[PDB]
């Protein structure tokens, strides 16, 4: 999943 910081949930979402 990697870093999912580009929506709202900046984590691996």
Task: Give the DSSP letter string of 1-13.
Answer: -----SSS--S--
| Residue 3 tokens, joined | 């870093």
The structure's method of determination equals NMR
**Cβ within 8 Å of residue 7, ≥6 positions away:** 13
Contact 2, 12 (CB under 8 A): yes
What token pair was written down for 8?
């709202």
4 CB-near residues (< 8 Å, 6+ apart):
10, 11, 12, 13
Residue given tokens 């900046």 in the structure block: 10
């Amino acid at each position: 999943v990697g870093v999912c910081c580009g929506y709202k949930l900046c984590h691996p979402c």
